[PDB]
Amino acid sequence: NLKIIVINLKRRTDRREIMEKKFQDENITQYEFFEAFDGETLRPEDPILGVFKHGVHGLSRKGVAGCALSHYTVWQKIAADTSGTKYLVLEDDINFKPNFKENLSKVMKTIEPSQAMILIGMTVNGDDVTKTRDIYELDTSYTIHPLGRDYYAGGLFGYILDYRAAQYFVDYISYNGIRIVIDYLTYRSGFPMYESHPHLVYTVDSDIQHQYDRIKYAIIPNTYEFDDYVFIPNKDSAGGDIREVCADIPILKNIADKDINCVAFNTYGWVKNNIKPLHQLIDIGNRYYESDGIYIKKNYLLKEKIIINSLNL
Amino acid sequence: NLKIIVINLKRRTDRREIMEKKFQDENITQYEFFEAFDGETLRPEDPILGVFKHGVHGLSRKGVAGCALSHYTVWQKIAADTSGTKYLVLEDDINFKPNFKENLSKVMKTIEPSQAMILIGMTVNVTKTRDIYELDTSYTIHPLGRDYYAGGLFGYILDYRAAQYFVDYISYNGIRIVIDYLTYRSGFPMYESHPHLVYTHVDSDIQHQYDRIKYAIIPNTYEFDDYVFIPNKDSAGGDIREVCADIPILKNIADKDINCVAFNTYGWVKNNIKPLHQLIDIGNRYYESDGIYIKKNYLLKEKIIINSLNL
Numbered sequence A: 001n002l003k004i005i006v007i008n009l010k011r012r013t014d015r016r017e018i019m020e021k022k023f024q025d026e027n028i029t030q031y032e033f034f035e036a037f038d039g040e041t042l043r044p045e046d047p048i049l050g051v052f053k054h055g056v057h058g059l060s061r062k063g064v065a066g067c068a069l070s071h072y073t074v075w076q077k078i079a080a081d082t083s084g085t086k087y088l089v090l091e092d093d094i095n096f097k098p099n100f101k102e103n104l105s106k107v108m109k110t111i112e113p114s115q116a117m118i119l120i121g122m123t124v125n126g127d128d129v130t131k132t133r134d135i136y137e138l139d140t141s142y143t144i145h146p147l148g149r150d151y152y153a154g155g156l157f158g159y160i161l162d163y164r165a166a167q168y169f170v171d172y173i174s175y176n177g178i179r180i181v182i183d184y185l186t187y188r189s190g191f192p193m194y195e196s197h198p199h200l201v202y203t204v205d206s207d208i209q210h211q212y213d214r215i216k217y218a219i220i221p222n223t224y225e226f227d228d229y230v231f232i233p234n235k236d237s238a239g240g241d242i243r244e245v246c247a248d249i250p251i252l253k254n255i256a257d258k259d260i261n262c263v264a265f266n267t268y269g270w271v272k273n274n275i276k277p278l279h280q281l282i283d284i285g286n287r288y289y290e291s292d293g294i295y296i297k298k299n300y301l302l303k304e305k306i307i308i309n310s311l312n313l
Numbered sequence B: 001n002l003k004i005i006v007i008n009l010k011r012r013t014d015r016r017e018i019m020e021k022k023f024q025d026e027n028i029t030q031y032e033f034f035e036a037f038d039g040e041t042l043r044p045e046d047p048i049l050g051v052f053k054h055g056v057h058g059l060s061r062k063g064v065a066g067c068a069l070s071h072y073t074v075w076q077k078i079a080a081d082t083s084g085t086k087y088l089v090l091e092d093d094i095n096f097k098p099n100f101k102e103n104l105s106k107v108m109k110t111i112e113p114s115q116a117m118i119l120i121g122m123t124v125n126v127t128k129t130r131d132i133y134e135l136d137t138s139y140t141i142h143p144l145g146r147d148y149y150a151g152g153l154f155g156y157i158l159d160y161r162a163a164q165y166f167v168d169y170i171s172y173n174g175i176r177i178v179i180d181y182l183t184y185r186s187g188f189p190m191y192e193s194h195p196h197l198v199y200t201h202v203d204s205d206i207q208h209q210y211d212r213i214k215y216a217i218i219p220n221t222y223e224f225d226d227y228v229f230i231p232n233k234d235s236a237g238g239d240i241r242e243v244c245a246d247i248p249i250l251k252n253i254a255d256k257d258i259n260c261v262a263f264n265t266y267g268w269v270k271n272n273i274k275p276l277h278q279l280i281d282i283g284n285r286y287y288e289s290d291g292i293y294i295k296k297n298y299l300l301k302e303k304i305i306i307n308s309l310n311l
């Protein structure tokens, strides 16, 4: 049956105790705490941070990043469970509307097979709170609807999902890194989302909103050699970009593999459709890796090589 | 719907007149002047300066401080307007590129809901920047070209979301960064127009003034239910960080941080303090009196245990 996961910082034993007491009052015994990534203690050299290494600096805020890692890690776990078991993921500061246990039960019973991602709470646009009280607050049907995308102002504090949604989110990140705050990431991912009527949970004490310090990434070893690419350390081809992803070489290499139009990627996280002549590559210093540089597809270079060597120079 | 605000010193009536004539020439008929904080007349004892009272002394330069206060006050106003109305904030020495009114209109029409902070001009640190900033005729909105940025809050479009974020940043940090770079370093997502719509000894009420405000000592009238104040005492080290010598700001930071057990009025918030009998003497520098606030919950825990002991 339903697995409940509560994302909780080890240090927030206050929040943990509150949640445990809430579950007791609801007679819910089937839950577990996920030990949340503490943004404060994330190590600058930890390779898991690769997903955040790009030009959207807001994602490097310690609390923002820790939160993102926590949901993402939970998704990896859920993604692995292809049994189809349902998970309810909660944050550790939520409130239950009265008769939570009964209401959740009714909602669960109503779920159809295609409803893989369901918000049972969300932040509603301030301007839309009044006009959506009928569907979100006052409703007594306990039914599941397409997400009201026009009303959405964030929230992964209460959602029911299975491996299908989790795997999709995980896949999205493998092609994008984490360039969007984690709740908006699900919203922008293109995965179909649903909602309960009414909402079952709702949410000021915050380990995120007042932390503006960013993780300062340590330079980490570049131990990556690939059969299909030549690596040129400390050189780049400015421009000719498809897009920026994130400074994570395995992620980048895979993206480059899958894209016929991609001829090169740099370790800063740019995947490129055009590069300059090699003699026109510019110098780039180590920012993320020892060494940073550019990977170029061998097939591209081999074509050039054959032709250039044939020429009467 | 766009509200235009021009930051202008009351004394710079010359700049004001120029701007008004510029608006006329551009057929912009609605705008208002914000009365800029004159750094020259900021009172040493004015409590508003608490945000500048720290070790980054460059922020205490009279013009720098006045400018910072002006944008910050404008942000407070905008932050209050949660209707989502767009504001265009200008400094009072800018030039409009030809066909400003029409071009602005085109830019406004392209705005997406997440684009809360948009530079329509900035100081650029040349082929690429001329093409995107000067020659471009698309009138579209892009992520800020962070690599090209060399400052500027002389022309920006924002709503309450950007303003409130900046305001919040300052409530947790004071103003330890020149105000333009503050937005840039704040972590808020910033955008830019292609092209830019506006552009800027050189006439300046900031860049020639190196004299700093010398802060007067002001009364410490602050008593808090959750803290005991010990005047003219400090606990050396055990610091999280220095913020600024502003007691209300500090108290709020201390409230919100479970690891914080004390703060001094010099602007240091602390995670560890010595035994009380090992507190050191510190003189009045910002407040009468300077000293240390210690959380009562911390001391009450000690008190219970110490009183239980066979002494």
Ligand SMILES: O=c1ccn([C@@H]2O[C@H](COP(=O)(O)OP(=O)(O)O)[C@@H](O)[C@H]2O)c(=O)[nH]1
Pocket: A007, A008, A009, A036, A037, A038, A039, A040, A062, A063, A064, A065, A066, A067, A068, A070, A090, A091, A092, A093, A205, A206, A207, A208, A209
């Ligand atoms: O460094 C952090 C801070 C928070 N969180 C988790 O993110 C959720 C929201 O945290 P909080 O309530 O502090 O933030 P807010 O709701 O204000 O964004 C909770 O489940 C936390 O355990 C996390 O994983 N790492």
Ligand SMILES: O=c1ccn([C@@H]2O[C@H](COP(=O)(O)OP(=O)(O)O)[C@@H](O)[C@H]2O)c(=O)[nH]1
Pocket: B006, B007, B008, B009, B036, B037, B038, B039, B040, B062, B063, B064, B065, B066, B067, B068, B070, B090, B091, B092, B093, B203, B204, B205, B206, B207
């Ligand atoms: O004491 C001062 C000096 C300037 N400013 C404002 O800051 C902006 C930039 O000032 P100025 O052009 O003199 O400075 P610069 O561009 O040389 O830094 C203008 O809107 C001024 O009204 C202010 O608020 N207080």
Ligand SMILES: [Mn+2]
Pocket: A091, A093, A203, A205, A206
């Ligand atoms: Mn929360």
Ligand SMILES: [Mn+2]
Pocket: B091, B093, B200, B203, B204
């Ligand atoms: Mn100027």
